[PDB]
């Protein structure tokens, strides 16, 4: 978990930015491994909790944490996913085939199925947080808002409504501050829409309160251009208002698995 600063070489190139600080490209001596380094009392405790979640995860469709390092600032060292965020990649590559989109979306469902089995809630499942190793290999990242579920509870109860990605949140998250694996299923539906819309932002030109009002009317985002009917049907099934009737990740992954192999053959 605790890495040697002497073995870490940070580059001038910045991969991303947020409230925490920045994400930069780096190199760590193991063979030398190319890494993405998240560089930062509240923010420090958030990074330590994020690292504790990532250390417990072992799946090919989840970004692996190398370890943590305390130097000029607190650092969270992760394996490098060269192609970067899914939303930005699809915005730059509009000629990416529909079969390729299903493939990447199915890989996210496989990673989320494992996360569901591991009893962890993502709480930030969006296209910007899906990183590409190759054009045919996707991994789930950004575990900053992620929580390890209690052994006696199937949901995480947030005490306060913080800086939340409301457009990706299920109604129970907005109304009761309850976050379950089925809440991540709703986010996955929005992620599916984003992927088939080639990195377009969901609910464009709308306020968070307007989105809540839209979903209460029973209204959902329209079918993206070129998106298959079966894939839009899954988006709508992920967008089931009532938690109990909404499918889990095992049912979502199976539907994607079967449809992907139908397109392949
Ligand atoms: C052309 C390279 O573009 C990028 C590659 C990137 N590779 C990463 C990466 N690899 N491993 C982890 C990360 N980054 C992140 O986890 N985040 C937080 C979601 C920064 C986007 N972030 C990237 C951001 C980029 F703009």
PDB file of C-alpha atoms and ligand atoms in Angstrom:
ATOM      1  CA  UNK A   1       0.000   0.000   0.000  1.00  0.00           C
ATOM      2  CA  UNK A   2       2.743   2.522   0.958  1.00  0.00           C
ATOM      3  CA  UNK A   3       4.903   3.370  -2.094  1.00  0.00           C
ATOM      4  CA  UNK A   4       8.471   4.753  -2.382  1.00  0.00           C
ATOM      5  CA  UNK A   5       8.618   8.368  -3.719  1.00  0.00           C
ATOM      6  CA  UNK A   6      12.144   7.685  -5.155  1.00  0.00           C
ATOM      7  CA  UNK A   7      10.617   4.959  -7.423  1.00  0.00           C
ATOM      8  CA  UNK A   8       7.859   7.399  -8.607  1.00  0.00           C
ATOM      9  CA  UNK A   9       8.579   9.792 -11.530  1.00  0.00           C
ATOM     10  CA  UNK A  10       5.847  12.439 -12.122  1.00  0.00           C
ATOM     11  CA  UNK A  11       5.385  14.022 -15.591  1.00  0.00           C
ATOM     12  CA  UNK A  12       4.369  17.657 -16.390  1.00  0.00           C
ATOM     13  CA  UNK A  13       1.305  16.396 -18.380  1.00  0.00           C
ATOM     14  CA  UNK A  14      -2.027  16.612 -16.479  1.00  0.00           C
ATOM     15  CA  UNK A  15      -4.620  13.905 -17.331  1.00  0.00           C
ATOM     16  CA  UNK A  16      -7.532  15.416 -15.350  1.00  0.00           C
ATOM     17  CA  UNK A  17      -8.694  17.935 -12.699  1.00  0.00           C
ATOM     18  CA  UNK A  18     -11.305  18.323  -9.921  1.00  0.00           C
ATOM     19  CA  UNK A  19     -12.017  19.756  -6.430  1.00  0.00           C
ATOM     20  CA  UNK A  20      -9.290  17.469  -4.923  1.00  0.00           C
ATOM     21  CA  UNK A  21      -6.587  18.906  -7.225  1.00  0.00           C
ATOM     22  CA  UNK A  22      -5.289  17.117 -10.356  1.00  0.00           C
ATOM     23  CA  UNK A  23      -4.566  13.694 -11.990  1.00  0.00           C
ATOM     24  CA  UNK A  24      -1.085  13.392 -13.623  1.00  0.00           C
ATOM     25  CA  UNK A  25       0.817  10.824 -15.759  1.00  0.00           C
ATOM     26  CA  UNK A  26       3.740   9.025 -14.080  1.00  0.00           C
ATOM     27  CA  UNK A  27       6.155   6.059 -13.950  1.00  0.00           C
ATOM     28  CA  UNK A  28       6.706   3.576 -11.085  1.00  0.00           C
ATOM     29  CA  UNK A  29       9.590   1.036 -10.824  1.00  0.00           C
ATOM     30  CA  UNK A  30       8.355  -2.536 -10.113  1.00  0.00           C
ATOM     31  CA  UNK A  31      10.072  -3.407 -15.148  1.00  0.00           C
ATOM     32  CA  UNK A  32       8.649   0.171 -15.020  1.00  0.00           C
ATOM     33  CA  UNK A  33       4.844   0.707 -14.935  1.00  0.00           C
ATOM     34  CA  UNK A  34       3.086   3.758 -16.494  1.00  0.00           C
ATOM     35  CA  UNK A  35       0.718   5.187 -13.869  1.00  0.00           C
ATOM     36  CA  UNK A  36      -2.016   7.805 -13.353  1.00  0.00           C
ATOM     37  CA  UNK A  37      -1.444   9.683 -10.077  1.00  0.00           C
ATOM     38  CA  UNK A  38      -4.335  11.423  -8.257  1.00  0.00           C
ATOM     39  CA  UNK A  39      -2.653  14.378  -6.442  1.00  0.00           C
ATOM     40  CA  UNK A  40      -4.477  16.234  -3.599  1.00  0.00           C
ATOM     41  CA  UNK A  41      -7.961  17.240   6.478  1.00  0.00           C
ATOM     42  CA  UNK A  42     -11.282  16.476   4.663  1.00  0.00           C
ATOM     43  CA  UNK A  43      -9.663  15.877   1.203  1.00  0.00           C
ATOM     44  CA  UNK A  44      -6.884  13.703   2.775  1.00  0.00           C
ATOM     45  CA  UNK A  45      -9.414  11.442   4.628  1.00  0.00           C
ATOM     46  CA  UNK A  46     -11.445  11.184   1.356  1.00  0.00           C
ATOM     47  CA  UNK A  47      -8.328   9.973  -0.577  1.00  0.00           C
ATOM     48  CA  UNK A  48      -7.402   7.428   2.186  1.00  0.00           C
ATOM     49  CA  UNK A  49     -10.998   6.005   2.175  1.00  0.00           C
ATOM     50  CA  UNK A  50     -10.924   5.899  -1.699  1.00  0.00           C
ATOM     51  CA  UNK A  51      -7.606   3.939  -1.540  1.00  0.00           C
ATOM     52  CA  UNK A  52      -9.046   1.485   1.064  1.00  0.00           C
ATOM     53  CA  UNK A  53     -11.982   0.669  -1.313  1.00  0.00           C
ATOM     54  CA  UNK A  54      -9.732   0.216  -4.432  1.00  0.00           C
ATOM     55  CA  UNK A  55      -7.263  -2.057  -2.512  1.00  0.00           C
ATOM     56  CA  UNK A  56     -10.127  -4.550  -1.804  1.00  0.00           C
ATOM     57  CA  UNK A  57     -11.095  -4.773  -5.524  1.00  0.00           C
ATOM     58  CA  UNK A  58      -9.622  -7.373  -7.926  1.00  0.00           C
ATOM     59  CA  UNK A  59     -11.404  -7.441 -11.320  1.00  0.00           C
ATOM     60  CA  UNK A  60     -10.177  -6.942 -14.957  1.00  0.00           C
ATOM     61  CA  UNK A  61     -12.902  -4.288 -15.563  1.00  0.00           C
ATOM     62  CA  UNK A  62     -11.910  -2.053 -12.592  1.00  0.00           C
ATOM     63  CA  UNK A  63      -8.863   0.317 -12.480  1.00  0.00           C
ATOM     64  CA  UNK A  64      -6.228  -1.262 -10.174  1.00  0.00           C
ATOM     65  CA  UNK A  65      -4.602   0.830  -7.437  1.00  0.00           C
ATOM     66  CA  UNK A  66      -0.784   0.445  -7.232  1.00  0.00           C
ATOM     67  CA  UNK A  67      -0.697   2.138  -3.818  1.00  0.00           C
ATOM     68  CA  UNK A  68      -0.478   5.452  -1.939  1.00  0.00           C
ATOM     69  CA  UNK A  69       2.414   7.919  -1.410  1.00  0.00           C
ATOM     70  CA  UNK A  70       2.880  10.835   1.044  1.00  0.00           C
ATOM     71  CA  UNK A  71       5.293  13.531  -0.207  1.00  0.00           C
ATOM     72  CA  UNK A  72       4.734  17.139  -1.531  1.00  0.00           C
ATOM     73  CA  UNK A  73       0.975  16.192  -1.386  1.00  0.00           C
ATOM     74  CA  UNK A  74      -1.065  12.975  -0.685  1.00  0.00           C
ATOM     75  CA  UNK A  75      -1.007  10.707  -3.788  1.00  0.00           C
ATOM     76  CA  UNK A  76      -3.251   7.866  -5.071  1.00  0.00           C
ATOM     77  CA  UNK A  77      -1.260   5.828  -7.661  1.00  0.00           C
ATOM     78  CA  UNK A  78      -3.364   3.816 -10.191  1.00  0.00           C
ATOM     79  CA  UNK A  79      -2.634   1.750 -13.340  1.00  0.00           C
ATOM     80  CA  UNK A  80      -2.695   3.893 -16.517  1.00  0.00           C
ATOM     81  CA  UNK A  81      -5.652   3.534 -18.939  1.00  0.00           C
ATOM     82  CA  UNK A  82      -4.008   5.220 -21.975  1.00  0.00           C
ATOM     83  CA  UNK A  83      -7.097   6.050 -24.099  1.00  0.00           C
ATOM     84  CA  UNK A  84      -8.796   7.869 -21.176  1.00  0.00           C
ATOM     85  CA  UNK A  85     -12.460   8.680 -20.402  1.00  0.00           C
ATOM     86  CA  UNK A  86     -15.145   6.961 -22.556  1.00  0.00           C
ATOM     87  CA  UNK A  87     -17.189  10.194 -23.070  1.00  0.00           C
ATOM     88  CA  UNK A  88     -14.153  12.172 -24.411  1.00  0.00           C
ATOM     89  CA  UNK A  89     -13.014   9.241 -26.624  1.00  0.00           C
ATOM     90  CA  UNK A  90     -16.460   8.836 -28.277  1.00  0.00           C
ATOM     91  CA  UNK A  91     -16.652  12.665 -28.800  1.00  0.00           C
ATOM     92  CA  UNK A  92     -13.294  12.445 -30.710  1.00  0.00           C
ATOM     93  CA  UNK A  93     -14.125   9.132 -32.471  1.00  0.00           C
ATOM     94  CA  UNK A  94     -17.717   9.411 -33.829  1.00  0.00           C
ATOM     95  CA  UNK A  95     -17.081   6.544 -36.341  1.00  0.00           C
ATOM     96  CA  UNK A  96     -16.807   3.912 -33.500  1.00  0.00           C
ATOM     97  CA  UNK A  97     -19.116   0.974 -34.461  1.00  0.00           C
ATOM     98  CA  UNK A  98     -22.334   0.139 -32.541  1.00  0.00           C
ATOM     99  CA  UNK A  99     -20.937  -3.418 -31.861  1.00  0.00           C
ATOM    100  CA  UNK A 100     -17.854  -1.784 -30.188  1.00  0.00           C
ATOM    101  CA  UNK A 101     -20.144   0.371 -27.940  1.00  0.00           C
ATOM    102  CA  UNK A 102     -22.132  -2.747 -26.795  1.00  0.00           C
ATOM    103  CA  UNK A 103     -18.757  -4.504 -26.094  1.00  0.00           C
ATOM    104  CA  UNK A 104     -17.463  -1.633 -23.855  1.00  0.00           C
ATOM    105  CA  UNK A 105     -20.857  -1.154 -22.090  1.00  0.00           C
ATOM    106  CA  UNK A 106     -21.001  -4.953 -21.416  1.00  0.00           C
ATOM    107  CA  UNK A 107     -17.456  -4.788 -19.907  1.00  0.00           C
ATOM    108  CA  UNK A 108     -18.696  -2.041 -17.483  1.00  0.00           C
ATOM    109  CA  UNK A 109     -21.694  -4.288 -16.501  1.00  0.00           C
ATOM    110  CA  UNK A 110     -19.226  -7.186 -15.813  1.00  0.00           C
ATOM    111  CA  UNK A 111     -17.164  -4.882 -13.547  1.00  0.00           C
ATOM    112  CA  UNK A 112     -20.348  -3.583 -11.868  1.00  0.00           C
ATOM    113  CA  UNK A 113     -21.632  -7.193 -11.396  1.00  0.00           C
ATOM    114  CA  UNK A 114     -18.408  -7.938  -9.413  1.00  0.00           C
ATOM    115  CA  UNK A 115     -18.832  -4.653  -7.414  1.00  0.00           C
ATOM    116  CA  UNK A 116     -22.448  -5.732  -6.582  1.00  0.00           C
ATOM    117  CA  UNK A 117     -21.170  -9.220  -5.449  1.00  0.00           C
ATOM    118  CA  UNK A 118     -18.389  -7.485  -3.401  1.00  0.00           C
ATOM    119  CA  UNK A 119     -21.168  -5.380  -1.689  1.00  0.00           C
ATOM    120  CA  UNK A 120     -19.668  -2.018  -2.750  1.00  0.00           C
ATOM    121  CA  UNK A 121     -21.637   0.963  -4.109  1.00  0.00           C
ATOM    122  CA  UNK A 122     -19.933   3.128  -6.766  1.00  0.00           C
ATOM    123  CA  UNK A 123     -22.070   6.338  -6.357  1.00  0.00           C
ATOM    124  CA  UNK A 124     -20.386   8.052  -9.400  1.00  0.00           C
ATOM    125  CA  UNK A 125     -21.020   5.639 -12.314  1.00  0.00           C
ATOM    126  CA  UNK A 126     -20.777   7.876 -15.416  1.00  0.00           C
ATOM    127  CA  UNK A 127     -19.144   7.738 -18.913  1.00  0.00           C
ATOM    128  CA  UNK A 128     -16.391  10.184 -17.712  1.00  0.00           C
ATOM    129  CA  UNK A 129     -15.433   7.560 -15.042  1.00  0.00           C
ATOM    130  CA  UNK A 130     -15.134   4.669 -17.546  1.00  0.00           C
ATOM    131  CA  UNK A 131     -11.553   4.569 -18.820  1.00  0.00           C
ATOM    132  CA  UNK A 132     -10.260   2.853 -21.944  1.00  0.00           C
ATOM    133  CA  UNK A 133      -7.107   0.683 -21.980  1.00  0.00           C
ATOM    134  CA  UNK A 134      -7.753   0.021 -25.727  1.00  0.00           C
ATOM    135  CA  UNK A 135     -10.724   0.666 -28.106  1.00  0.00           C
ATOM    136  CA  UNK A 136     -11.990  -2.826 -26.975  1.00  0.00           C
ATOM    137  CA  UNK A 137     -11.076  -2.725 -23.218  1.00  0.00           C
ATOM    138  CA  UNK A 138     -12.954  -0.591 -20.624  1.00  0.00           C
ATOM    139  CA  UNK A 139     -12.302  -0.216 -16.854  1.00  0.00           C
ATOM    140  CA  UNK A 140     -14.324   1.508 -14.087  1.00  0.00           C
ATOM    141  CA  UNK A 141     -12.523   4.322 -12.186  1.00  0.00           C
ATOM    142  CA  UNK A 142     -13.154   7.184  -9.658  1.00  0.00           C
ATOM    143  CA  UNK A 143     -14.040   5.529  -6.327  1.00  0.00           C
ATOM    144  CA  UNK A 144     -14.067   8.911  -4.498  1.00  0.00           C
ATOM    145  CA  UNK A 145     -17.783   8.650  -3.570  1.00  0.00           C
ATOM    146  CA  UNK A 146     -17.743   4.799  -3.251  1.00  0.00           C
ATOM    147  CA  UNK A 147     -18.824   3.063  -0.012  1.00  0.00           C
ATOM    148  CA  UNK A 148     -18.379  -0.420   1.479  1.00  0.00           C
ATOM    149  CA  UNK A 149     -21.898  -1.587   2.452  1.00  0.00           C
ATOM    150  CA  UNK A 150     -22.633  -2.688   6.043  1.00  0.00           C
ATOM    151  CA  UNK A 151     -23.029  -6.472   6.576  1.00  0.00           C
ATOM    152  CA  UNK A 152     -26.655  -5.902   7.797  1.00  0.00           C
ATOM    153  CA  UNK A 153     -27.658  -3.317   5.089  1.00  0.00           C
ATOM    154  CA  UNK A 154     -28.164  -3.473   1.285  1.00  0.00           C
ATOM    155  CA  UNK A 155     -27.854   0.360   1.004  1.00  0.00           C
ATOM    156  CA  UNK A 156     -25.683   3.319   2.142  1.00  0.00           C
ATOM    157  CA  UNK A 157     -27.474   6.217   3.894  1.00  0.00           C
ATOM    158  CA  UNK A 158     -25.857   9.641   3.322  1.00  0.00           C
ATOM    159  CA  UNK A 159     -26.268  12.088   6.257  1.00  0.00           C
ATOM    160  CA  UNK A 160     -26.037  15.208   4.005  1.00  0.00           C
ATOM    161  CA  UNK A 161     -26.567  16.026   0.281  1.00  0.00           C
ATOM    162  CA  UNK A 162     -23.037  16.852  -0.928  1.00  0.00           C
ATOM    163  CA  UNK A 163     -21.588  17.780  -4.366  1.00  0.00           C
ATOM    164  CA  UNK A 164     -23.633  15.129  -6.216  1.00  0.00           C
ATOM    165  CA  UNK A 165     -23.834  14.108  -9.919  1.00  0.00           C
ATOM    166  CA  UNK A 166     -27.680  14.360  -9.757  1.00  0.00           C
ATOM    167  CA  UNK A 167     -28.246  13.604 -13.500  1.00  0.00           C
ATOM    168  CA  UNK A 168     -26.837  10.069 -12.879  1.00  0.00           C
ATOM    169  CA  UNK A 169     -28.738   9.524  -9.578  1.00  0.00           C
ATOM    170  CA  UNK A 170     -31.780   7.275  -9.037  1.00  0.00           C
ATOM    171  CA  UNK A 171     -34.975   8.779  -7.422  1.00  0.00           C
ATOM    172  CA  UNK A 172     -34.311   7.032  -4.029  1.00  0.00           C
ATOM    173  CA  UNK A 173     -30.869   8.804  -3.900  1.00  0.00           C
ATOM    174  CA  UNK A 174     -32.493  12.257  -4.384  1.00  0.00           C
ATOM    175  CA  UNK A 175     -35.595  11.574  -2.209  1.00  0.00           C
ATOM    176  CA  UNK A 176     -34.241   9.370   0.651  1.00  0.00           C
ATOM    177  CA  UNK A 177     -30.364   9.640   0.351  1.00  0.00           C
ATOM    178  CA  UNK A 178     -30.306   5.799  -0.068  1.00  0.00           C
ATOM    179  CA  UNK A 179     -27.574   4.325  -2.310  1.00  0.00           C
ATOM    180  CA  UNK A 180     -27.705   0.626  -3.270  1.00  0.00           C
ATOM    181  CA  UNK A 181     -26.284  -1.544  -6.119  1.00  0.00           C
ATOM    182  CA  UNK A 182     -29.682  -1.006  -7.839  1.00  0.00           C
ATOM    183  CA  UNK A 183     -29.001   2.792  -7.538  1.00  0.00           C
ATOM    184  CA  UNK A 184     -25.768   2.151  -9.554  1.00  0.00           C
ATOM    185  CA  UNK A 185     -28.012   0.261 -12.105  1.00  0.00           C
ATOM    186  CA  UNK A 186     -29.924   3.557 -12.728  1.00  0.00           C
ATOM    187  CA  UNK A 187     -26.533   5.353 -13.223  1.00  0.00           C
ATOM    188  CA  UNK A 188     -25.538   2.508 -15.619  1.00  0.00           C
ATOM    189  CA  UNK A 189     -28.672   3.267 -17.701  1.00  0.00           C
ATOM    190  CA  UNK A 190     -27.565   6.935 -17.993  1.00  0.00           C
ATOM    191  CA  UNK A 191     -23.996   5.665 -18.802  1.00  0.00           C
ATOM    192  CA  UNK A 192     -25.525   3.468 -21.601  1.00  0.00           C
ATOM    193  CA  UNK A 193     -27.371   6.541 -23.015  1.00  0.00           C
ATOM    194  CA  UNK A 194     -24.079   8.574 -22.940  1.00  0.00           C
ATOM    195  CA  UNK A 195     -22.151   5.770 -24.731  1.00  0.00           C
ATOM    196  CA  UNK A 196     -24.771   5.333 -27.505  1.00  0.00           C
ATOM    197  CA  UNK A 197     -25.015   9.196 -27.803  1.00  0.00           C
ATOM    198  CA  UNK A 198     -21.198   9.321 -28.469  1.00  0.00           C
ATOM    199  CA  UNK A 199     -20.236  11.125 -25.242  1.00  0.00           C
ATOM    200  CA  UNK A 200     -23.131  13.636 -25.311  1.00  0.00           C
ATOM    201  CA  UNK A 201     -24.151  15.054 -21.888  1.00  0.00           C
ATOM    202  CA  UNK A 202     -27.445  13.617 -20.491  1.00  0.00           C
ATOM    203  CA  UNK A 203     -30.507  15.894 -19.897  1.00  0.00           C
ATOM    204  CA  UNK A 204     -28.862  18.803 -21.819  1.00  0.00           C
ATOM    205  CA  UNK A 205     -29.920  22.371 -20.943  1.00  0.00           C
ATOM    206  CA  UNK A 206     -31.796  21.086 -17.851  1.00  0.00           C
ATOM    207  CA  UNK A 207     -31.361  21.871 -14.124  1.00  0.00           C
ATOM    208  CA  UNK A 208     -31.147  19.087 -11.487  1.00  0.00           C
ATOM    209  CA  UNK A 209     -34.641  19.996 -10.170  1.00  0.00           C
ATOM    210  CA  UNK A 210     -36.024  19.910 -13.776  1.00  0.00           C
ATOM    211  CA  UNK A 211     -34.570  16.341 -14.223  1.00  0.00           C
ATOM    212  CA  UNK A 212     -36.288  15.216 -10.934  1.00  0.00           C
ATOM    213  CA  UNK A 213     -39.581  16.791 -12.197  1.00  0.00           C
ATOM    214  CA  UNK A 214     -39.135  15.025 -15.615  1.00  0.00           C
ATOM    215  CA  UNK A 215     -38.559  11.544 -14.029  1.00  0.00           C
ATOM    216  CA  UNK A 216     -41.571  12.059 -11.663  1.00  0.00           C
ATOM    217  CA  UNK A 217     -43.815  12.603 -14.767  1.00  0.00           C
ATOM    218  CA  UNK A 218     -42.541   9.157 -15.882  1.00  0.00           C
ATOM    219  CA  UNK A 219     -40.542  10.763 -18.711  1.00  0.00           C
ATOM    220  CA  UNK A 220     -37.155   9.366 -19.827  1.00  0.00           C
ATOM    221  CA  UNK A 221     -34.455  10.459 -22.337  1.00  0.00           C
ATOM    222  CA  UNK A 222     -35.196   9.564 -25.976  1.00  0.00           C
ATOM    223  CA  UNK A 223     -33.477   6.841 -28.023  1.00  0.00           C
ATOM    224  CA  UNK A 224     -30.041   7.959 -29.359  1.00  0.00           C
ATOM    225  CA  UNK A 225     -29.491   7.938 -33.167  1.00  0.00           C
ATOM    226  CA  UNK A 226     -28.444   4.464 -34.373  1.00  0.00           C
ATOM    227  CA  UNK A 227     -28.948   2.847 -30.928  1.00  0.00           C
ATOM    228  CA  UNK A 228     -30.664  -0.598 -31.196  1.00  0.00           C
ATOM    229  CA  UNK A 229     -34.193  -1.059 -29.756  1.00  0.00           C
ATOM    230  CA  UNK A 230     -32.968  -3.887 -27.415  1.00  0.00           C
ATOM    231  CA  UNK A 231     -30.274  -1.556 -25.947  1.00  0.00           C
ATOM    232  CA  UNK A 232     -32.778   1.308 -25.413  1.00  0.00           C
ATOM    233  CA  UNK A 233     -35.172  -1.232 -23.765  1.00  0.00           C
ATOM    234  CA  UNK A 234     -32.346  -2.106 -21.285  1.00  0.00           C
ATOM    235  CA  UNK A 235     -31.723   1.665 -20.607  1.00  0.00           C
ATOM    236  CA  UNK A 236     -35.453   2.018 -19.733  1.00  0.00           C
ATOM    237  CA  UNK A 237     -35.342  -1.161 -17.572  1.00  0.00           C
ATOM    238  CA  UNK A 238     -32.334   0.401 -15.711  1.00  0.00           C
ATOM    239  CA  UNK A 239     -34.555   3.529 -15.392  1.00  0.00           C
ATOM    240  CA  UNK A 240     -37.265   1.663 -13.365  1.00  0.00           C
ATOM    241  CA  UNK A 241     -38.461   4.187 -10.696  1.00  0.00           C
ATOM    242  CA  UNK A 242     -39.202   1.582  -7.951  1.00  0.00           C
ATOM    243  CA  UNK A 243     -36.024  -0.053  -6.498  1.00  0.00           C
ATOM    244  CA  UNK A 244     -37.678  -3.507  -5.928  1.00  0.00           C
ATOM    245  CA  UNK A 245     -38.750  -3.846  -9.615  1.00  0.00           C
ATOM    246  CA  UNK A 246     -35.416  -2.480 -11.004  1.00  0.00           C
ATOM    247  CA  UNK A 247     -33.002  -5.297 -12.101  1.00  0.00           C
ATOM    248  CA  UNK A 248     -29.664  -5.995 -10.399  1.00  0.00           C
ATOM    249  CA  UNK A 249     -26.286  -6.113 -12.189  1.00  0.00           C
ATOM    250  CA  UNK A 250     -26.453  -9.925 -12.743  1.00  0.00           C
ATOM    251  CA  UNK A 251     -29.675  -9.489 -14.824  1.00  0.00           C
ATOM    252  CA  UNK A 252     -28.281  -6.354 -16.613  1.00  0.00           C
ATOM    253  CA  UNK A 253     -24.938  -8.082 -17.514  1.00  0.00           C
ATOM    254  CA  UNK A 254     -26.748 -11.252 -18.813  1.00  0.00           C
ATOM    255  CA  UNK A 255     -29.013  -9.147 -21.130  1.00  0.00           C
ATOM    256  CA  UNK A 256     -25.914  -7.309 -22.488  1.00  0.00           C
ATOM    257  CA  UNK A 257     -23.930 -10.609 -22.767  1.00  0.00           C
ATOM    258  CA  UNK A 258     -26.705 -12.294 -24.839  1.00  0.00           C
ATOM    259  CA  UNK A 259     -27.280  -9.244 -27.093  1.00  0.00           C
ATOM    260  CA  UNK A 260     -23.517  -8.717 -27.715  1.00  0.00           C
ATOM    261  CA  UNK A 261     -23.081 -12.368 -28.845  1.00  0.00           C
ATOM    262  CA  UNK A 262     -26.199 -12.015 -31.095  1.00  0.00           C
ATOM    263  CA  UNK A 263     -24.507  -9.046 -32.895  1.00  0.00           C
ATOM    264  CA  UNK A 264     -21.068 -10.847 -32.995  1.00  0.00           C
ATOM    265  CA  UNK A 265     -22.626 -13.982 -34.629  1.00  0.00           C
TER     266      UNK A 265
HETATM  267  C1  LIG B   1      -4.964  10.735 -24.354  1.00  0.00           C
HETATM  268  C2  LIG B   1      -4.860  10.421 -22.860  1.00  0.00           C
HETATM  269  O1  LIG B   1      -6.032  10.973 -22.241  1.00  0.00           O
HETATM  270  C3  LIG B   1      -6.249  10.626 -20.937  1.00  0.00           C
HETATM  271  C4  LIG B   1      -5.851   9.387 -20.417  1.00  0.00           C
HETATM  272  C5  LIG B   1      -6.138   9.066 -19.087  1.00  0.00           C
HETATM  273  N1  LIG B   1      -5.894   7.992 -18.338  1.00  0.00           N
HETATM  274  C6  LIG B   1      -6.377   8.210 -17.111  1.00  0.00           C
HETATM  275  C7  LIG B   1      -6.324   7.311 -16.045  1.00  0.00           C
HETATM  276  N2  LIG B   1      -5.742   6.115 -15.985  1.00  0.00           N
HETATM  277  N3  LIG B   1      -5.930   5.620 -14.864  1.00  0.00           N
HETATM  278  C8  LIG B   1      -6.653   6.436 -14.084  1.00  0.00           C
HETATM  279  C9  LIG B   1      -6.907   7.523 -14.807  1.00  0.00           C
HETATM  280  N4  LIG B   1      -7.650   8.593 -14.480  1.00  0.00           N
HETATM  281  C10 LIG B   1      -8.665   8.646 -13.599  1.00  0.00           C
HETATM  282  O2  LIG B   1      -8.991   7.685 -12.899  1.00  0.00           O
HETATM  283  N5  LIG B   1      -9.302   9.821 -13.488  1.00  0.00           N
HETATM  284  C11 LIG B   1     -10.410  10.001 -12.532  1.00  0.00           C
HETATM  285  C12 LIG B   1     -11.695   9.416 -13.124  1.00  0.00           C
HETATM  286  C13 LIG B   1      -8.937  10.989 -14.309  1.00  0.00           C
HETATM  287  C14 LIG B   1      -9.898  11.087 -15.495  1.00  0.00           C
HETATM  288  N6  LIG B   1      -6.932   9.422 -17.080  1.00  0.00           N
HETATM  289  C15 LIG B   1      -6.810   9.977 -18.279  1.00  0.00           C
HETATM  290  C16 LIG B   1      -7.221  11.206 -18.796  1.00  0.00           C
HETATM  291  C17 LIG B   1      -6.936  11.529 -20.123  1.00  0.00           C
HETATM  292  F1  LIG B   1      -7.323  12.720 -20.624  1.00  0.00           F
END
